Amino acid sequence: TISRVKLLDTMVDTFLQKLVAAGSYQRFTDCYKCFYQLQPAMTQQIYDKFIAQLQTSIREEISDIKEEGNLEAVLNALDKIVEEGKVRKEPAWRPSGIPEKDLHSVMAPYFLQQRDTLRRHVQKQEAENQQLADAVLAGRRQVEELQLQVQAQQQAWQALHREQRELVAVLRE
Amino acid sequence: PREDFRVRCTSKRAVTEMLQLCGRFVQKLGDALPEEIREPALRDAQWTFESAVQENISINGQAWQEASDNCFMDSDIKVLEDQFDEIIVDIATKRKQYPRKILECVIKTIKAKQEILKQYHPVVHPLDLKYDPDPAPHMENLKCRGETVAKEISEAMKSLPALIEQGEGFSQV
Amino acid sequence: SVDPMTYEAQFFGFTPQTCMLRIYIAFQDYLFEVMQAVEQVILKKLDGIPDCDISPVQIRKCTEKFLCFMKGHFDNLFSKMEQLFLQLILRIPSNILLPEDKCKETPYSEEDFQHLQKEIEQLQEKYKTELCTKQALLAELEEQKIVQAKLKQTLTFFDELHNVGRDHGTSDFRESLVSLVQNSRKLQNIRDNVEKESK
Amino acid sequence: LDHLKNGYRRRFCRPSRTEQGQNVLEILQDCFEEKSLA
Amino acid sequence: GITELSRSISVDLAESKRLGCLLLSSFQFSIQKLEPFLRDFSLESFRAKASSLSEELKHFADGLETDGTLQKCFESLEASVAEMKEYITKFSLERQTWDQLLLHYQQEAKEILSRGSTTYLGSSQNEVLNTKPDYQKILQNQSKVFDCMELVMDELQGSVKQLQAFMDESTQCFQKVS
């Protein structure tokens, strides 16, 4: 659990530790002979300025790339996600080269909730239409049983027609 | 006819290298030759020599002039790796922020279809054409007529047996 | 081989290899910069010398030698350090999934998806029919009220007619008429019988 | 001067991965000191 | 007829030895090709060389046939370049699929979002909405029922006068008994 910035600084520091060691004073001397015979202290100063300005220059470079695009916050975010998720130990989902599969995978729930919303709505409307239609059927029963009574009393009044008939029959010689 | 009489070599580089090696023999042949023509005749001996080597050799069923060599320089690799990097960061950006914008569009059109579905609730189908009403101008007239006839036949039934009484009263003494 | 790191670059916004190349072309250029420094510094210091020159095309080739040594060791060290950089940093450990695609862990089959959207359109239209079905049922009932009230009105007229009949003497003219004819049938019968006697 | 290495292949021939491995300080010292002499 | 140098020799001795024999035969072909243009025996002093270093070419081909530099004619950067050139076209196709798949939902959202402004079949109660009786027919039925009522009423009120005439006639005839 080392912050990736610390591993970066350790890689730069060790890289320089092995460059200043590979760049030995003997290595800068046995080739720069011709100069080393005279003023063996001027050569030491030149090698010192060379190695110091080199290592400070490269450390300034990595310090400039850490502030390139807030790379410290990006690596801290990566450490966060690693610590936030280092519980699975299983290979995570890597995006398969099928865009429609991933897009349908993200779009699935927002379509499920729509399907079930319309389901509840259409079931409510279905029940309301059921009870309302039952009321319509009862109303039809009532209007028909009313028509039957209207016709019943109408014929009841048309019944005395025959009574008038044999009335006028016996009233004529 | 029967082809592939040429030596099958899976590499064009080795032929050029060993040919450049053995060129010093035909180059050494120019010693026993007049100096007036030795240079263009050694050029002609070289071109006809290695030309006779190439016309009678074939890489992989391919002629010397039509066969490519698998030797890639640094420029080709820089261009190809550049385009490759371009497509890696590009497809990465697509995978990252494309499902989010597509999700925005689909989540807009879903609640848009639900919103246009709610505004449909005023379906308002008129119906009820209906008919003309006949009130009670002659209804009360029919009731009064029934009153006149009712009381008229009541008084008729009251006064008729009195006429039967006068009738049977004159039938004896 | 040839790993594009399409997921490692999805989080960072650049391929790690390209970033390592920029770091390289930075470090190498810095090395040659300090070599220009030591070279021109030993050149300016060279003008002030007694004896003979021991310079200048001689003092430069030496810098080329030490530069070749530094390019060898620097190049190897940068290769190993870059392998370390691609191992411990700039790498998604495959143990971890980015929060950018959190929901794509559980796939959804395309048959269930096309089935689901088709069911969505079907239920949209189905609701659209149920709504106007409610409208038509409510309209037929509301209009049915009127015919029910009209039939009740005619029945009220018949009941009121039997009430106007119940008063004034004869409730229903069925037992009256059959009694009006009978008593009349006698009145004729006793009429003829009194016309044959009056002769 | 001005003579250098310029190609620097970006993605050519190198192995891959490491999980729980004794806190990677060891792998830091071990990735260095590999194969090279003066 | 330079191609005749190919079919000239040795099909059974593998391929490297045939390549060496091709080297010697090509050398002799160039040597014989240079002869037809000699101005100034000068011809006789030539073969003493041609045969000599042609034999040294024979021993040079026979010597380095064994070491390896000749048999290296017959046998990974190219592999990784191939895998890379396949990856780049696969990601090209996927990038196209992403662009089109995004524009599809963009213009779908704009189209549906700009579309709403600019009794059915298969109903649940479809049986009930189809068994609708004629109510206006019932109202007309009442309209004529009242007419039948009025005509029966007028028939009755006519029969009461048909009777009334006989009641007055009978009550007046029975009064004539005086």
At C123, which amino acid appears?
L
Query: How many CB atoms sit inside 10 A of residue E28's CB?
Result: 16
B23 part of a folded domain = yes
Domain that holds residue B102: 72-132
| A72-85 burial code (b ≥16 CB/10 A, e <16) | eebbeebbebeeee
**What's the CA gap between E33 and B52, in Å, rounded?**
11
Joined together, the tokens standing for residue C38 give 């030591």
Residue B86, in any domain of the structure: yes
Rounded distance between C-alpha atoms, residue A168 and residue A171, angstroms:
5
Does B82 share its domain with B37?
A: no
Under 8 Å between Cβ of C187 and A172? no
**Which sign, positive or negative, has the C-alpha torsion C166, C167, C169, C173?**
negative
Answer whether the bond into residue B34 is a cis peptide, omega within 30°. Answer: no
B76 and B128 share one domain: yes
Q: How far is CA C47 from the centre of its chain?
A: 79
Angle at the Cα of A20 from the Cα atoms of A17 and A23, rounded to 5 degrees:
145
Resolution in Å, one decimal, please: 3.5
The residues of D whose Cβ lies within 8 A of any Cβ of B are 6-7, 9-11
Residue A130 lies in a domain: no
Tell me which residue range forms the domain holding A158.
141-173
Best mutation target, C2, C29, C94, to test chain D (most D CBs within 10 A): C2
Q: Where are the alpha helices (DSSP H) in chain A?
A: 4-22, 25-30, 33-36, 42-66, 71-85, 99-158, 160-170
Q: Domain for residue B103, yes or no?
A: yes
B82 plus B120 within the same structural domain: yes
- Rounded to a whole number of angstroms, the distance from the CA of C178 to the nearest CA of chain A is 6
Backbone CA torsion sign across C25, C31, C37, C43: negative
Instruction: Tell whether C115 is within 8 A of chain E (Cβ).
Output: no
Same domain (yes/no): B88, B123:
yes
* Residue A167 near residue B160 (C-beta atoms within 8 A): no
Within this chain, do residues B76 and B123 fall inside the same structural domain, yes or no?
A: yes
Instruction: Give domain status of residue A79, yes or no.
Output: yes
Return the residue in E101, E131, E159 with the most chain A beta carbons within 10 A, the one to mutate for interface testing: E159
The reply to whether B102 and B124 lie within a common domain is yes
For residue A37, the SS3 value is coil
**From the list C22, C37, C94, which residue is nearest A91 (CB)?**
C94
Whether C129 and C121 have beta carbons less than 8 Å apart is answered as: no
Technique employed here was: X-ray
Is residue A44 one of the residues assigned to a domain? yes
Residue pair B11/E72 in contact (Cβ under 8 Å)? The answer is yes
Alpha-carbon span A113 to E14, nearest angstrom:
74
Contact C148 A142 (CB under 8 A): yes
Minimal Cβ distance to A103: which of E101, E138, E152: E101
Shared domain for B14 and B41, answered yes or no, is: yes
Q: Per the structure, how many domains does chain B have? A: 2
Phi-psi region at E152: left, alpha or beta (left = phi > 0; alpha = psi -120 to 50) = alpha
Does the beta-carbon distance from B89 to C190 stay under 8 Å? no
Q: Which two tokens stand for residue E163?
A: 């009777």
Q: Residue window 149-178, chain E: list those with CB within 8 Å of chain A.
A: 149, 152, 155-156, 159, 162-163, 166
Number of domains in chain A: 2
Question: Could you write out the three-class secondary structure of chain B?
Answer: CCCCCCEECCCHHHHHHHHHHHHHHHHHHHHCCCCCCHHHHHHHHHHHHHHHHHHCEECCCCCCCCCCCCCCCHHHHHHHHHHHHHHHHHHHHHHHHHHHHHHHHHHHHHHHHHHHHHCCCCCCCCCCCCCCCCCCCCHHHHHHHHHHHHHHHHHHHHHHHHHHHHHHHCCCC
Choose the final residue of a domain: A85, A114, A131.
A85
